[PDB]
Design a protein around this ligand. Structure first.
Ligand SMILES: O=C(Nc1nccs1)c1cccc(CN2C(=O)N(Cc3cccc(C(=O)Nc4nccs4)c3)[C@H](Cc3ccccc3)[C@H](O)[C@@H](O)[C@H]2Cc2ccccc2)c1
Lengths: 99, 99
């Protein structure tokens, strides 16, 4: 759908049998999700943002349905204020930025 | 123009007589530029990012060319690692997110 930027672009995602709300985020290379339970294995990782670096658990390849659209990729779970869908999944649902 | 997100969506801005590149960031409510020489005076603000919070100078009423497009807005200048243009200016250059 087309989404204007007068408001945060949040979408509903279902991950892991749970529904979440997440921000669509063109500056983020990676999807980062607030602490939640996934089944399976993960790797420790660190990413930086404004403010600092956080240590995060890298899970792949997780199925996520974002709006209607299914995608599979790496998600990282950690101490983020908000669930962020970054460009690794945005490419997968065909998202463009248009001005 | 239409950007796909296989790379980071970078644009040239002209800000304060200086040419820079910045990231078009739908997740960022506020535009934050690395420290630079801006005239005029300002107010301290803090904003929060993913690794915590950063303290920045707030200038209002700043002219930016972002691609061909002039906008006038609030710019925070401070300890970011990238120049981010956020939704306060994105909305002025008429940016849409599309999937
Ligand atoms: O993959 C990532 N990093 C990797 N590291 C290594 C490999 S990959 C990664 C994934 C998600 C987010 C980010 C880090 N990140 C942020 O920290 N901010 C804070 C931000 C940026 C700009 C403005 C504001 C703002 O307006 N804050 C405000 N607070 C109060 C009022 S306004 C906030 C938000 C997201 C956000 C919003 C609210 C709370 C928390 C975060 C941006 O929207 C993101 O795109 C991105 C920007 C960025 C990108 C690269 C390096 C540094 C910074 C990085």
């Amino acid at each position: 759908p087309q989404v204007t930027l007068w408001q945060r672009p949040l979408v509903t995602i279902k991950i892991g049998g749970q529904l979440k709300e997440a921000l669509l985020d063109t500056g983020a290379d990676d999807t980062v999700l607030e602490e939640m339970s996934l089944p399976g294995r993960w790797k420790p990782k660190m990413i930086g943002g404004i403010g600092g670096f956080i240590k995060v658990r890298q899970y792949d390849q997780i199925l996520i349905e974002i709006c209607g659209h299914k995608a599979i990729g790496t998600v990282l779970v950690g101490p983020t204020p908000f669930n962020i869908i970054g460009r690794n999944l945005l490419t997968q649902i065909g998202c463009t930025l248009n001005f």
